Design a binder for this molecule. Structure first.
Ligand SMILES: CCCCCCCCCCCCCCCCCC(=O)OC[C@H](CO[C@@H]1O[C@H](CO[C@H]2O[C@H](CO)[C@H](O)[C@H](O)[C@H]2O)[C@H](O)[C@H](O)[C@H]1O)OC(=O)CCCCCCCCCCCCCCCCC
Ligand code: CLA
Ligand code: CLA
Ligand code: CLA
Ligand code: CLA
Ligand code: CLA
Ligand SMILES: CCCCCCCCCCCCCCCCCC(=O)OC[C@H](CO[C@@H]1O[C@H](CO)[C@H](O)[C@H](O)[C@H]1O)OC(=O)CCCCCCCCCCCCCCCCC
Ligand SMILES: CCCCCCCCCCCCCCCC(=O)OC[C@H](COP(=O)(O)OC[C@@H](O)CO)OC(=O)CCCCCCCCCCCCCCC
Ligand code: HEC
Ligand SMILES: CCCCCCCCCCCCO[C@@H]1O[C@H](CO)[C@@H](O[C@H]2O[C@H](CO)[C@@H](O)[C@H](O)[C@H]2O)[C@H](O)[C@H]1O
Ligand SMILES: CCCCCCCS[C@@H]1O[C@H](CO)[C@@H](O)[C@H](O)[C@H]1O
Ligand SMILES: CCCCCCCS[C@@H]1O[C@H](CO)[C@@H](O)[C@H](O)[C@H]1O
Ligand code: OEX
Ligand SMILES: [Ca+2]
Ligand SMILES: [Ca+2]
Ligand SMILES: [Cl-]
Ligand SMILES: [Cl-]
Ligand SMILES: [Cl-]
Lengths: 243, 49, 334, 137, 151, 34, 201, 97, 30, 97
C-alpha cells in the first residue's frame, strides 16, 4: 500500500486505479438492496477538438491536441446514489466530489482551447435488467457544463458580470454597440454527454474499471466568442457498495 | 513651480516632507502613469547611469 | 608544452582581445544561452500563465506587444519554486505556456553575471592590478539576485520574480509597494541616497575636472585633444579644482587627496546600492517599511491622518486591484 | 474633542441600565483587547470569519443580545454562534476553554468587564471605522 | 460548516475555490497558496492520504484542535513592519508582532551577504599581496607596458 | 493592431537623418590628408 | 440655451484632458460634434432630482455616482453587485431630456439611463460623428494645450542656452583651459586677502 | 572585460558631467507635460485590441488596473476639497481583497 | 511592420556593438 | 440582445429582500436568529416555489418555525439564477469586508 511520500511528484496522483486482467467477474445486484458508488474516478488520455471549417458544409472532424496544463486533468473522489430501477436498469446519480478540472489543450498552429472538463450533476443509466454488473454493462448519461469562469471573473480591462466595470473605460467616447459583446458578460450553461464502457469487474470487491468517452462544449469566454466542441476519451474506475 | 502652475493650485505641488514626497510619487503613478513616460525613463537612465 | 597546458595558457592569456579566463569558461556559454533564449522569447513567445490561474499574459512582440509593454513573463504560480527545465515539460508548447523561458534565462544569467564578477577579479590579477573593481560590481549584481532569486525564494514562487521587460518592471515595483511599503523602508531610502548621491557626485566630479583642465589647445579644436593616452602628467590641476570647491562650501569639505576622492566616488553609490539590494532581500521575508497607519490620535481618540495614511490609501488601491482573479481568501499572505 | 464620561457610559444590561467606565478602565480595556483579541479582531472585524463583526448593531442583533456589558462578559465565558444555537468554546477563546486558549488563563472578571467596555466604547469614538475593515482605513 | 461542498466548488478562474491539483495531480489547497503545496505540518497531515488532501477526511475528520491551530497560524503569519506592526503593509496599528522567523531570516541574509563581500575583499587582497602588488603598480615595471597591444 | 500609420516613417526618418549626418562627417574626416 | 454655450460645458473641450502621444485634432478622439442632445435630468422612483458627479480633469476614468441636491448619494453604477444598494435598477432611475435633439423624451430602461449617466460625467451630452475620421474615442488637447506645452518646454531649454552662452562670454579667456602657469598661491587660503587678487598678498 | 574603454581622461570627465545632467533635464521636460496632464498614459493600439478581446492581457493593462485602484482608493482623502463620497459598492476591487 | 521596426533597430544596435569593439580606433600611447 | 443578468436581478425583489433561491448566505446575518443554523438549512433546501414553503423544511423545531414565521416578511423568491448559484457562490461569493 503506497503512501503520499511514495506517490508525490510521480504523476501517479492524476491516475485512476486499475484492475488486473484476472478481473472479468460479475457483481450481483440485489434489487431489494440500496447501493452507492463510493468512488468514481475519470482519467482522460486524449482530448479531441472539432475543427471549424470555412465552408460550413464539410464533414468537420475531431482533431488531436496537446495538453499544456500538465497532470492536473482527472476527476476523482466522486460519489453518489446507485438506484435500481423498476426495469432492472441501474442509474448513478452524482452527488459530490472533485467533478471538474479546467484544462487547456493546444491545436496545430497554436490555438489554445480551455474547457471545463466535467461530469457535474451526472445522471447515467445502464441497460434494462442488469442483475449483475459485468464486462457487458455500460452507463450512458448527461451532465451540466457551467461557464468555465464563474461570475466574479474579471477580464484584463477589469470588466465582469457579478463584479467589474460595465464598459470600456479606456475608450471613454467610443460608440458602445460594437463593444456590446465584450462589455456585457454572459454565463453559459450547457449539457454534456458521456458513456462508460465496463472492461473489468471484480465481483468480490465491487470494483469496476473501463473506458469512457464524453462530449461537451469548451470555454466561450463569458459570451465573448463561440465555444468549440470537445470530445474527451480515457479510462475510469468505480467502487460499488451496498449503502 | 511649473507643474502646479499648470494644475488647479499649489495644493498639487509636492509638499516638503519625506512621506509627503512619497505620496507625490504614488500620485504621479496612479494619475499620470509617469513610469511609462519616455522623458522620465531618460531621467532614470541618467541617474542610474 | 602539452595540450592541456597550451589550452590553459590560451584561456588565461593576457593577449586575447577579450579576456577569457576560467570564470569566462562558465560565463560565455551561460550568457549566450540566456541572451539567445531572451531574444527569441521576447520576439516570438506565446502568452504565459504567470499566476497559475489559466489567465495567460502576452509578453512578445509578435503577440501584440511593443518594446515598452513587452516582457519575458515569469514562470507559473502553479510551479512555485520547483525547477522547471525544458526536459520537465511534456512538450515545448507546455514549457512555453507555463513560463519555462523565464527560468532558463534568469538561472543562466545569474550564473553568468556571477562569473562576470569573478572574471573582473581574475583579469585584475593577471594584469598586476589591485583587485576590488569586482567588489564594486557586487552592488548591481546583488540587486539582480534580490529581484530574480531572493524575493521569489522568500515569497515561495518565481511567479513573483521581476519580469524581464519594462512595463513588467513597473508592475513588480507597484505590487512591491502595495505589499511591503518599500518607500517607508530605510534600506530603500539609503538606496535612493546612493543613486541620487551617485548622480550628484558624478556630475560634480565631471564638472570640477572639466573646469580645471590645463590649456593645451586652441579655440577651434576640442579640449579633448589636449590629453594624450598614456601621458605621464595629470591633465587637470587638482589644486585649482580644490581651490574652487573648498571655497564653494568651505575648505575642509573639499577633498585635496585624489585617492581619497576617488575612494569616496566608489564607496557612496556602492554602499547605498548594497542597502537597496538588502531592502529587497529582507522584504523578501516580509520585514517591511515603517507602518504609521493611525499613529496620530486626538484626545477623544479620533484618527488624525498624516502623510503616512495617504500613502496607506494609495497602497490599498494597489493591493485590492493586483492579480484581480487570483485571491479567494481575505488575506494576501504571499 | 475629549473622552468624556458620557462617551464612556455604556449599557450594562438589556433593561436600560448603564455603567460609566473610568479612563483607566478604558485604557485597560484597550490593552487587554490587544492582548487577547486583536490578533483576530483588530479594528472591530473578525479575520477568521469576516461575516461577523463587533459593531454595536451586529451585537444587538445577536442571540442572546451581545450589545451590553453582561452580554459580552457572558460571551467571553461561554461564546455561542450568532443565533445562540451552538457553544463554540472549543474553537473560540473563553474562560471555559482557558485550558486550550492559555491567554485567557489570567483574565479576571474585572478584565472581562474592561474588554467588554472597550468593545462597546470604541465605535462611539471611531464610528464606521470600527468593524469597517480596509475600506475605512 | 455553512454547507459548502468544497470538493466541487469551482472558483472564479475555473480552478477549485478550495481544492485543486498540483502539476503532478496531488490534491492541494487552492487560491494563491497553490504555490505552497510542498508544505507539511502535524496539524495538516491527518487530512492527507496517498493522493494528497483527502475529501472524505476533510468532510468527516477535522478536529476542533486543527481548526484552532489553523486559525492561530493564519493570524500569526510572518508579515509585519520594521516598527513591529503585525500584518500586511496596509494594516492599522493594533497588534505588536513581527515573527521570529522574519527577524532570524532577514538578519542572517544581511550578515551572509556582507560576509560574501568580505570574502571577495580579503580573497582578492590576499592574492594581490601574495603576488606583491597590493600596494599598487610599479611605475618602472608596469606589466601592461610589456604586453603586446590588443589591436 | 491599430497603430498610428505615420509611426513607421517617423521612426525611419528619425533614425536615418541624424545617422546620415554623422556618416557624412565621419567619411570626409577620414578622407582628409593623413 | 445656444448649442455653442452647452458645448463649452463639456469636458471633451477641456485642454487638460489630452495625452502627449495622442496626436492630431480634437475631432480624432471623441469625434466631430454634430448636435447637442439636450440637457439630461435624472430622477429616482420617488421623483427626486438626481445629479451626476462630474469628472475632474485629473482622472482618466471615473465612477458614476448620483446624489440629491444636498450631496446625499442616491444611485450609482456598482462594481461588486452582491451588496449593492444604489443600483439604477433598485432605485428606479430615469432620465428626461430638455432642449437639443432628445427634447421632450424620457428613458426608463436601465441600460439607456446608465449610458446617459456615463456621458453626464463629461458635462453636457453631444452626438458625434466618429466615422468620418475613424475617431478612437480617446480625448486630445486643443491648440491651447499644444501651444502651452511647446512654449513652456522651449522656454525651459532656452534657460540652458542663456547659461551656456553667458558662461562662454564671461570666461572666454579660459575656455580652452586654465593657465598652465597658475600659481598655487592664487588658490591657497589666506595668501591673498581678496580671493584671486594678486595685489592683496 | 567590457569590450570598450575610455582612453581620453578629458572625455571621461566631460561624460561624467553629461550623463546625469542630461538625464535630469529630460525628466524636467516630461514634468512640464504633466503640468498640463499631457501624459504618456496609454498606447491606443493596446486599448483598441484589449477593449475588443477579453483574453488579451499585457503588463501594460495590468499596470492600468493598479492605477485605477490607486485613484479610487486614494482620492477621497488626498483631494478633500472635491468632497468625494465613493460608496463601497463602486470601489474597484479584485476577488476577496 | 512595428515588430519588424523594433527588431531592425535592435539588430542595428548589435551590429554597432560589433564594430565599436572589434573595429574601434586603436588606443595609441603617444 | 445582451443583458447582464445580475444587474437585471437587482430590479426584482432580489434587490429588496433575502431571496431564498439565490442570495448568498451571509445576508441571513441581517436578522435575529437566522445564522448560521437556519441559514444553512434554508440554502441547503432551496429552491422554493414561494416563501412560505420554507416552513416545510424537514426537522424544524417549533422555535425555528416561529423564528421563520417572524422573518417571512424579509424573504422573497425569484427564479434560480445560475450565475449566482454556481461555483458555490451562495456559501462564499468572493466578498469579505
Ligand atoms: C534612525 C536614526 C539612526 C541614527 C544612526 C544610528 C545607526 C543605527 C540605528 C539603530 C536604531 C537606534 C534606535 C533603536 C531603538 C530600537 O530599536 O527600539 C526597538 C526595540 C525596543 O522597543 C521595543 O520594540 C519591540 C519590538 O517588537 C518586539 O517585541 C514585541 C512585544 O513583545 C513583539 O513581540 C514583536 O513581535 C517583537 O518584534 C516592541 O515594539 C516594544 O513595544 C518596544 O518597547 O529595541 C530593540 O528591539 C533592540 C534592537 C537590537 C538590534 C535588533 C537587530 C535586528 C536586525 C534585523 C536585521 C534585518 C534587516 C533590518 C532592516 C532595517
Ligand atoms: C558553462 C556551461 C553551462 C552551465 C554551467 C549551464 C547551466 C545550466 N543549464 Mg545550460 N546550456 C548550455 C551551457 C551551460 N548551462 C549550453 C551550451 C546549452 C545548449 C546545449 C545549454 C542548454 C540548456 C537547456 C535547454 C537547459 C539548460 C539548463 C541549465 C540549468 C540546469 C542544469 C542542470 O540541471 O544540470 C545538472 C548537472 C549537474 C548537477 C552536473 C554537475 C556535476 C559536477 C561535476 C559535480 C557537482 C557540482 C555541484 C552541483 C556544484 C559545483 C560547485 C563548483 C564550485 C565546482 C543550469 C543553470 C536548464 C534550465 O535552464 O532549467 C531552468 C534547461 O532547461 N541548459
Ligand atoms: C541575529 C541578530 C539578531 C536578531 C535576529 C534579533 C531579533 C530581535 N531582537 Mg535582538 N539583539 C541583538 C541581535 C538580534 N536581535 C543584538 C546584537 C543586541 C544588542 C544590541 C540585541 C538586544 C536586544 C534588545 C534589548 C531587544 C532585542 C529585541 C529583538 C526582537 C525585536 C527586534 C527589533 O525590533 O529590531 C529593531 C530593528 C533595528 C534596531 C534595525 C537594525 C538595523 C541595523 C543597524 C542594520 C545593520 C546592517 C549591517 C549589519 C551593517 C553593515 C555595514 C556595511 C557598511 C558593511 C527581535 C526578535 C527586543 C525584544 O523584543 O526582546 C524581547 C528588545 O527589547 N534585542
Ligand atoms: C560569489 C561568488 C564567488 C566569487 C566571484 C569568488 C571569487 C574568488 N574566490 Mg571564492 N568562494 C566562494 C564564492 C566566490 N568566490 C564561496 C561561497 C566559498 C566558500 C565555499 C569560496 C571559497 C574560496 C576558496 C577556498 C578560494 C576562493 C578563492 C577566490 C578567488 C580566486 C579565484 C578562485 O579560485 O575561485 C574559486 C571559486 C569558488 C570557490 C566559487 C565560485 C562561484 C562562482 C559563482 C562560479 C560558480 C560556477 C559553477 C562552477 C557552475 C555550477 C553550475 C551548476 C548547474 C552545476 C576569487 C576572488 C581562492 C583565493 O585565491 O582566495 C584567496 C581560494 O583559494 N574562494
Ligand atoms: C510650437 C510648435 C508647434 C505646436 C504647439 C503645434 C501644434 C499642433 N500641430 Mg503643428 N507643426 C509644427 C509646429 C507646431 N505645431 C511644425 C514645426 C510642423 C512641421 C513639421 C508642424 C506640422 C503639423 C502637421 C502636418 C500637423 C500638425 C498638427 C498640430 C496639432 C496637433 C499636435 C500634435 O498632435 O502633436 C504631437 C506632439 C508630439 C507627438 C510630441 C513629439 C515630441 C518629440 C518626439 C520629443 C523628442 C525628444 C528628443 C529626440 C530627445 C533628445 C535627447 C537628447 C537631447 C539627449 C497641434 C494644434 C496636426 C493637425 O491636427 O493639423 C490640422 C497635423 O496634422 N502640425
Ligand atoms: C539660475 C538662474 C540664473 C543664473 C545662475 C544666471 C547667470 C547669469 N546671468 Mg542670467 N538671468 C536669469 C537667470 C540666471 N542667470 C533670469 C531668470 C533672467 C531674466 C530673463 C536673466 C536675465 C539676464 C540678462 C539680461 C543677463 C544675464 C546675465 C547672466 C550672467 C552674469 C551674471 C548676472 O547678470 O546675473 C543676473 C542676476 C540675477 C539672475 C539675480 C536677480 C535677483 C532678483 C533681482 C531678485 C528678485 C526678488 C523678487 C523681486 C522677489 C519677489 C518675487 C515675487 C514672485 C513675489 C550669469 C551667467 C548677463 C550675461 O550673460 O552677460 C554676459 C546678462 O546680460 N541674465
Ligand atoms: C529635415 C527632415 C526632418 C525629418 C524629421 C523626421 C520626423 C521625426 C519624427 C518626429 C516624431 C513626431 C511625430 C509623432 C507621431 C505622429 O505621427 O504625429 C502626427 C502629428 C499629426 O497628427 C495626425 O493628424 C491627422 C490629421 O491632421 C490625423 O488625425 C492623424 O491620426 C494624427 O496622427 O504630426 C504633428 O502634429 C507634428 C506637429 C507636432 C507639434 C509638437 C509641438 C511640441 C513639440 C515640442 C518638442 C520639444 C521636445 C524637445 C526635447 C529635447
Ligand atoms: C564579455 C563581453 C561583454 C560586452 C559585450 C557587449 C558590450 C557592448 C558595449 C557597447 C559597445 C558600443 C559602444 C559605442 C560607442 C563607443 O564605441 O565608445 C567608445 C568610447 C571610447 O572612449 P575614448 O575615451 O577612447 O574616446 C575619446 C575621444 O575619441 C572622444 O571623442 O567609449 C566611451 O565613450 C565610454 C562611454 C560610453 C559607453 C556607452 C555604453 C553603452 C552600453 C549599452 C547601452 C545600449 C544597450 C541597448 C540594448 C538594446
Ligand atoms: C481568532 C482566533 C479569534 C480570537 C483570538 C478571538 N475571536 Fe472573537 N470571534 C472569532 C470568530 C471566528 C468569531 C465568529 C464565531 C462564530 O462562528 O459565530 C468571533 C465572534 C466574536 C464575538 C461575537 C460577534 C458577533 O456576535 O457579532 C465576540 C463578541 C467576540 N468574538 C469577542 C472576542 C473577544 C472579546 C476576544 C478576546 C478575548 C476574542 N473574541 C478573541 C475569532 C476570534
Ligand atoms: C543609408 C545610406 C548609407 C550609404 C552608405 C555609403 C557609404 C560610403 C562609403 C564611402 C567610403 C569612402 O572611403 C574613404 O575614402 C577616402 C579616399 O576616397 C579615404 O581617404 C584616404 O585617401 C584620401 C584621398 O587622397 C586621403 O586624403 C586620406 O588621407 C586617406 O585616409 C578614407 O580613409 C575612406 O574613409
Ligand atoms: C527560429 C525560431 C523561429 C521562432 C519559431 C516560433 C514557433 S513556430 C510558429 O508557432 C506559431 C504558434 O504555434 C504558429 O502559428 C506558426 O505557424 C509557427 O511558425
Ligand atoms: C445604447 C446607448 C444608448 C445611449 C446613447 C449613448 C450616449 S450618447 C452617444 O455617445 C457616443 C460616444 O460614446 C457618441 O459617439 C454618440 O454620438 C452619442 O449618441
Ligand atoms: O503573486 Mn504576484 O503578488 Ca506576491 O501577494 Mn500574493 O502573490 Mn500574488 O498576491 Mn499579492
Ligand atoms: Ca464492455
Ligand atoms: Ca472605427
Ligand atoms: Cl498585478
Ligand atoms: Cl487566496
Ligand atoms: Cl455589514
Amino acid at each position: 500500500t503506497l503512501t503520499y511520500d511514495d506517490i508525490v511528484g510521480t504523476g501517479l496522483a492524476n491516475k485512476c486505479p486499475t484492475l488486473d486482467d484476472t478481473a472479468r467477474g460479475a457483481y450481483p445486484i440485489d434489487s431489494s438492496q440500496t447501493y452507492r458508488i463510493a468512488r468514481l474516478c475519470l482519467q482522460p488520455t486524449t482530448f479531441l477538438v472539432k475543427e471549424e471549417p470555412k465552408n460550413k458544409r464539410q464533414e468537420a472532424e475531431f482533431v488531436p491536441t496537446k495538453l499544456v496544463t500538465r497532470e492536473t486533468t482527472s476527476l476523482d473522489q466522486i460519489q453518489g446514489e446507485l438506484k435500481v430501477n423498476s426495469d432492472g436498469s441501474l442509474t448513478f446519480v452524482e452527488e459530490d466530489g472533485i467533478d471538474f478540472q479546467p484544462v487547456t489543450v493546444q491545436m496545430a498552429g497554436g490555438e489554445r482551447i480551455p474547457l471545463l472538463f466535467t461530469v457535474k450533476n451526472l445522471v447515467a443509466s445502464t441497460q434494462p435488467n442488469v442483475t449483475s454488473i459485468t464486462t457487458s454493462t455500460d452507463f450512458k448519461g448527461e451532465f451540466n457544463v457551467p461557464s468555465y469562469r464563474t461570475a466574479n471573473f474579471l477580464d484584463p480591462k477589469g470588466r465582469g458580470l457579478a463584479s467589474g466595470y460595465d464598459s470600456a473605460i479606456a475608450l471613454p467616447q467610443a460608440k458602445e454597440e460594437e463593444l456590446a459583446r465584450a462589455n456585457v458578460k454572459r454565463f453559459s450553461l450547457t449539457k454534456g454527454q458521456i458513456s462508460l464502457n465496463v472492461a473489468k469487474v471484480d465481483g468480490r470487491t465491487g470494483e469496476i474499471a473501463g473506458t469512457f468517452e464524453s462530449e461537451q462544449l469548451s470555454d466561450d469566454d463569458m459570451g465573448a466568442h463561440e465555444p468549440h466542441e470537445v470530445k474527451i476519451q480515457g479510462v475510469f474506475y468505480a467502487s460499488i457498495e451496498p449503502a | 513651480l511649473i507643474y502646479p502652475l499648470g494644475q488647479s493650485s499649489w495644493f498639487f505641488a509636492p509638499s516638503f516632507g519625506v512621506a509627503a514626497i512619497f505620496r507625490f510619487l504614488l500620485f504621479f503613478q496612479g494619475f499620470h502613469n509617469w513610469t511609462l513616460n519616455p522623458f522620465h525613463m531618460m531621467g532614470v537612465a541618467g541617474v542610474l547611469g | 608544452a602539452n595540450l592541456w597546458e597550451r589550452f590553459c595558457n590560451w584561456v588565461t592569456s593576457t593577449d586575447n582581445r577579450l579576456y577569457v579566463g576560467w570564470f569566462g569558461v562558465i560565463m560565455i556559454p551561460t550568457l549566450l544561452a540566456a541572451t539567445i533564449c531572451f531574444v527569441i522569447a521576447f520576439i516570438a513567445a506565446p502568452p504565459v500563465d504567470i499566476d497559475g490561474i489559466r489567465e495567460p499574459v502576452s509578453g512578445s512582440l509578435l503577440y501584440g506587444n511593443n518594446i515598452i509593454t513587452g516582457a519575458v513573463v515569469p514562470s507559473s504560480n502553479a510551479i512555485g519554486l520547483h525547477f522547471y527545465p525544458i526536459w520537465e515539460a511534456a512538450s515545448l508548447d507546455e514549457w512555453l505556456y507555463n513560463g519555462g523561458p523565464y527560468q532558463l534565462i534568469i538561472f543562466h544569467f545569474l550564473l553568468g553575471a556571477s562569473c562576470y564578477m569573478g572574471r573582473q577579479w581574475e583579469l585584475s590579477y593577471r594584469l598586476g592590478m589591485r583587485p576590488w573593481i569586482c567588489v564594486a560590481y557586487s552592488a548591481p549584481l546583488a540587486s539582480a539576485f534580490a529581484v530574480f532569486l531572493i524575493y521569489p525564494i522568500g515569497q515561495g514562487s518565481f511567479s513573483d520574480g521581476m519580469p524581464l521587460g519594462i512595463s513588467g518592471t513597473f508592475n513588480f515595483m507597484i505590487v512591491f509597494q502595495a505589499e511591503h511599503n518599500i518607500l517607508m523602508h530605510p534600506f530603500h531610502q539609503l538606496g535612493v541616497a546612493g543613486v541620487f548621491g551617485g548622480a550628484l557626485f558624478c556630475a560634480m566630479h565631471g564638472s570640477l575636472v572639466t573646469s580645471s583642465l590645463i590649456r593645451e589647445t586652441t579655440e577651434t579644436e576640442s579640449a579633448n585633444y589636449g590629453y594624450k593616452f598614456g601621458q605621464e602628467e595629470e591633465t587637470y590641476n587638482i589644486v585649482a579644482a580644490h581651490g574652487y570647491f573648498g571655497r564653494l562650501i568651505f575648505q575642509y569639505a573639499s577633498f585635496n587627496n585624489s585617492r581619497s576622492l576617488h575612494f569616496f566616488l566608489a564607496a557612496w553609490p556602492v554602499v547605498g546600492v548594497w542597502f537597496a539590494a538588502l531592502g529587497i532581500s529582507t522584504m523578501a521575508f516580509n520585514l517591511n517599511g515603517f507602518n504609521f497607519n493611525h499613529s496620530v490620535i486626538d484626545a477623544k481618540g479620533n484618527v488624525i491622518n498624516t502623510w503616512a495614511d495617504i500613502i496607506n490609501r494609495a497602497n490599498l488601491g494597489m493591493e485590492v486591484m493586483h492579480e484581480r482573479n487570483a485571491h479567494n481568501f481575505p488575506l494576501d499572505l504571499a | 474633542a475629549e473622552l468624556t464620561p458620557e462617551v464612556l457610559t455604556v449599557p450594562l444590561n438589556s433593561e436600560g441600565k448603564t455603567i460609566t467606565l473610568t479612563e483607566k478602565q478604558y485604557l485597560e480595556g484597550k490593552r487587554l483587547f490587544q492582548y487577547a483579541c486583536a490578533s483576530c479582531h483588530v479594528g472591530g472585524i473578525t479575520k477568521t470569519n469576516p461575516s461577523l463583526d463587533l459593531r454595536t448593531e451586529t451585537l444587538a442583533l445577536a442571540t442572546p443580545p451581545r450589545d451590553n456589558i453582561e452580554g459580552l462578559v457572558d460571551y467571553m465565558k461561554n461564546p455561542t454562534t450568532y443565533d445562540g444555537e451552538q457553544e463554540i468554546a472549543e474553537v473560540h477563546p473563553s474562560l471555559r476553554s482557558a485550558d486550550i486558549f492559555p491567554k485567557m488563563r489570567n483574565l479576571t472578571e474585572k478584565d472581562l468587564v474592561a474588554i467588554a467596555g472597550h468593545i462597546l466604547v470604541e465605535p462611539k469614538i471611531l464610528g464606521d471605522k470600527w468593524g469597517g475593515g480596509k475600506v475605512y482605513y | 460548516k455553512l454547507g459548502a461542498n468544497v470538493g466541487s466548488a469551482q472558483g472564479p478562474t475555473g480552478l477549485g475555490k478550495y481544492l485543486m491539483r498540483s502539476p503532478t495531480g496531488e490534491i492541494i489547497f487552492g487560491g494563491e497558496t497553490m504555490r505552497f503545496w510542498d508544505f507539511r505540518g502535524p496539524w495538516l497531515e491527518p487530512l492527507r492520504g496517498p493522493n494528497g488532501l483527502d475529501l472524505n477526511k476533510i468532510k468527516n475528520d477535522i478536529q476542533p484542535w486543527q481548526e484552532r491551530r489553523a486559525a492561530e497560524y493564519m493570524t500569526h503569519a510572518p508579515l509585519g513592519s520594521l516598527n513591529s506592526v503585525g500584518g500586511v503593509a496596509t494594516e492599522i496599528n493594533s497588534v505588536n508582532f513581527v515573527s521570529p522567523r522574519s527577524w532570524l531570516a532577514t538578519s542572517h541574509f544581511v550578515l551572509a551577504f556582507f560576509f560574501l563581500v568580505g570574502h571577495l575583499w580579503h580573497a582578492g587582497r590576499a592574492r594581490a599581496a601574495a603576488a606583491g602588488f597590493e600596494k599598487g603598480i610599479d611605475r618602472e615595471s608596469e606589466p601592461v607596458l610589456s604586453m603586446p597591444s590588443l589591436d | 493592431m491599430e497603430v498610428n500609420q505615420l509611426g513607421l516613417i517617423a521612426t525611419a526618418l528619425f533614425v536615418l537623418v541624424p545617422s546620415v549626418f554623422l556618416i557624412i562627417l565621419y567619411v570626409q574626416t577620414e578622407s582628409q590628408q593623413k | 440655451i445656444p448649442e455653442k454655450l452647452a458645448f463649452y460645458d463639456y469636458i471633451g473641450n477641456n485642454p487638460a484632458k489630452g495625452g502627449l502621444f495622442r496626436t492630431g485634432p480634437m475631432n480624432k478622439g471623441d469625434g466631430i460634434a454634430q448636435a447637442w442632445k439636450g440637457h439630461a435630468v435624472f430622477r429616482n422612483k420617488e421623483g427626486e432630482e438626481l445629479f451626476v458627479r462630474r469628472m475632474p480633469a485629473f482622472f482618466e476614468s471615473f465612477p458614476v455616482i448620483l446624489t440629491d441636491k444636498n450631496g446625499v448619494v442616491k444611485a450609482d453604477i456598482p462594481f461588486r453587485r452582491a451588496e449593492s444598494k444604489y443600483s439604477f435598477e433598485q432605485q428606479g432611475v430615469t432620465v428626461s431630456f430638455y432642449g437639443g435633439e432628445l427634447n421632450g423624451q424620457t428613458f426608463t430602461d436601465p441600460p439607456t439611463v446608465k449610458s446617459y449617466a456615463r456621458k453626464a460625467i463629461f458635462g453636457e451630452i453631444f452626438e458625434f460623428d466618429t466615422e468620418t475620421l475613424n475617431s478612437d474615442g480617446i480625448f486630445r488637447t486643443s491648440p491651447r494645450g499644444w501651444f502651452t506645452f511647446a512654449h513652456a518646454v522651449f522656454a525651459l531649454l532656452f534657460f540652458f542656452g542663456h547659461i551656456w552662452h553667458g558662461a562662454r562670454t564671461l570666461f572666454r579667456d579660459v575656455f580652452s583651459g586654465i593657465d598652465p602657469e597658475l600659481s598655487p598661491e592664487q588658490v591657497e587660503w589666506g595668501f591673498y586677502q581678496k580671493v584671486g587678487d594678486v595685489t592683496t598678498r | 572585460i567590457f569590450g570598450i574603454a575610455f582612453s581620453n581622461k578629458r572625455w571621461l570627465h566631460f561624460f561624467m558631467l553629461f550623463v546625469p545632467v542630461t538625464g535630469l533635464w529630460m525628466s524636467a521636460i516630461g514634468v512640464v507635460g504633466l503640468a498640463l496632464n499631457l501624459r504618456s498614459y496609454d498606447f491606443i493600439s493596446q486599448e483598441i485590441r484589449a477593449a475588443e478581446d477579453p483574453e488579451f492581457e499585457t503588463f501594460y493593462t495590468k499596470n492600468l488596473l493598479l492605477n485605477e485602484g490607486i485613484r479610487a482608493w486614494m482620492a477621497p482623502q488626498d483631494q478633500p476639497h472635491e468632497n468625494f463620497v465613493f460608496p463601497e459598492e463602486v470601489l474597484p476591487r479584485g476577488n476577496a481583497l | 511592420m512595428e515588430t519588424i521596426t523594433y527588431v531592425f533597430i535592435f539588430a542595428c544596435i548589435i551590429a554597432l556593438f560589433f564594430f565599436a569593439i572589434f573595429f574601434r580606433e586603436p588606443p595609441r600611447i603617444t | 440582445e445582451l443583458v447582464n443578468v445580475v444587474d437585471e436581478k437587482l430590479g426584482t425583489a432580489y434587490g429588496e429582500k433575502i431571496d431564498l433561491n439565490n442570495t448568498n448566505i451571509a445576508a441571513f446575518i441581517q436578522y435575529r436568529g437566522l445564522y448560521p443554523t437556519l441559514a444553512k438549512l434554508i440554502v441547503k433546501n432551496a429552491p422554493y416555489e414561494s416563501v412560505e414553503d420554507v416552513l416545510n423544511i424537514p426537522g424544524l423545531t417549533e422555535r425555528q418555525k416561529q423564528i421563520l414565521r417572524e422573518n417571512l416578511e424579509h424573504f422573497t423568491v425569484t427564479e434560480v439564477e445560475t450565475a449566482l448559484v454556481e461555483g458555490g457562490d451562495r456559501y462564499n461569493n468572493g466578498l469579505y469586508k
